[PDB]
Swiss-Prot record:
It catalyses: L-seryl-[protein] + ATP = O-phospho-L-seryl-[protein] + ADP + H(+); L-threonyl-[protein] + ATP = O-phospho-L-threonyl-[protein] + ADP + H(+). The chain holds residues 5 to 271 of 476 of the full protein. The gene is CHEK1. ATP binds at residues 11-19, 34. It is an enzyme of class 2 (transferase). Serine/threonine-protein kinase which is required for checkpoint-mediated cell cycle arrest and activation of DNA repair in response to the presence of DNA damage or unreplicated DNA. May also negatively regulate cell cycle progression during unperturbed cell cycles. This regulation is achieved by a number of mechanisms that together help to preserve the integrity of the genome. Recognizes the substrate consensus sequence [R-X-X-S/T]. Binds to and phosphorylates CDC25A, CDC25B and CDC25C. GO terms for molecular function: ATP binding; histone H3T11 kinase activity; protein domain specific binding; protein kinase activity; protein serine kinase activity; protein serine/threonine kinase activity. Its EC number is 2.7.11.1. It is linked to Oocyte/zygote/embryo maturation arrest 21: An autosomal dominant, female infertility disorder characterized by zygote development arrest due to failure of pronuclei fusion. Residues 1-253 are annotated as: Interaction with CLSPN. This is Serine/threonine-protein kinase Chk1. It comes from the Eukaryota. Residues 5-253 form the Protein kinase domain. Phosphorylated by ATR in a RAD17-dependent manner in response to ultraviolet irradiation and inhibition of DNA replication. Phosphorylated by ATM in response to ionizing irradiation. Ubiquitinated. Mono or diubiquitination promotes nuclear exclusion. Ubiquitination and degradation are required to terminate the checkpoint and ensure that activated CHEK1 does not accumulate as cells progress through S phase, when replication forks encounter transient impediments during normal DNA replication. 'Lys-63'-mediated ubiquitination by TRAF4 at Lys-120 activates cell cycle arrest and activation of DNA repair. One of its GO terms (cellular component) is intracellular membrane-bounded organelle.
Length: 259
């Protein structure tokens, strides 16, 4: 009977189907079941490569007709999105802890040559101890294989989180794109709002940032220390944008905090 599971509740809904909570009949172990009506083959292949404490673990899959089932590590704390209070954000120490964990998971992915391509609070989950787990690898791809980097060209992601080079250039490096979205997530956590609809030449809020008008929201709400880190992350030229090894040396990143 140890291979029997009960579907007890609906957790979420992807663009493909729904996420349900399954509980083992014998052990009471819980696992999230992603249901996609019925891209998916690739998501499964990438998931099989993942093994890190800040990345949702993959247990297996099953296809029963035109419906694909993905078995994943259950994150009872839900989406990071739901911890962000509109127009407020969250306490700085919590944001810093989540950011440290997000960096750990991103360093891990990049180390194995995987880029997520859709980092945002809806795709960052929390376990029962509020540990952050990167989730939703449906847009992820390989950017390094046999120690050779491949440039990306596919436009994908979520506009408010995408880096400007994706919109403007035919090809671009993968890593700086994921660094940029992490910066947008940090901004959301500290201000409870996204800075712009998209980082385009025609977006006023993006121009304001390029013009250093930090006396405006959301910047005004952010302390000088984390704001200085955002100044290094949200840099238009991806070749000049801060890399993760340098983020790890940032003053705010290393500031001891607590509520
Ligand atoms: N792997 C999981 O665990 C898992 N995976 N995906 C979820 N939602 C997707 C939806 C599409 C965007 N990306 C997130 C999700 C929602 C959860 C939850 C947990 C507790 C509660 Cl009260 C509510 C929801 S747990 C969970």
């Amino acid at each position: 009977f140890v291979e029997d599971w009960d579907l007890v509740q609906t957790l979420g809904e992807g663009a493909y189907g729904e996420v349900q909570l399954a509980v083992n009949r014998v052990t009471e172990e819980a696992v999230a079941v992603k249901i996609v009506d019925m891209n998916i083959k690739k998501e499964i292949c990438i998931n099989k490569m993942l093994n890190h404490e800040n990345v949702v673990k993959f247990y297996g899959h099953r296809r029963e007709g035109n419906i694909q089932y993905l078995f994943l590590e259950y994150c009872s704390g839900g989406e990071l999105f739901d911890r962000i209070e509109p127009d407020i954000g969250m306490p700085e120490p919590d944001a810093q802890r989540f950011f440290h964990q997000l960096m750990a998971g991103v360093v891990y992915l990049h180390g194995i040559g995987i880029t997520h391509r859709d980092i945002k609070p809806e795709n960052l989950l929390l376990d029962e101890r509020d540990n952050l787990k990167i989730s939703d690898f449906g847009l992820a791809t390989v950017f390094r294989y046999n120690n050779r980097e491949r440039l990306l060209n596919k436009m994908c992601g979520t506009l408010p989180y995408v880096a400007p080079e994706l919109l403007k250039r035919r090809e671009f490096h993968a890593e700086p794109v994921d660094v940029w979205s992490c910066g947008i997530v940090l901004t959301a956590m500290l201000a409870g709002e996204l800075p712009w609809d998209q980082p385009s030449d025609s977006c006023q809020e993006y121009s304001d940032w390029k013009e250093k008008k930090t006396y405006l929201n959301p910047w005004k709400k952010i302390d000088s220390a984390p704001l200085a880190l955002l100044h290094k992350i949200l840099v238009e030229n991806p070749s000049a944008r801060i890399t993760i090894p340098d983020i790890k040396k940032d003053r705010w990143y290393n500031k001891p905090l607590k509520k």
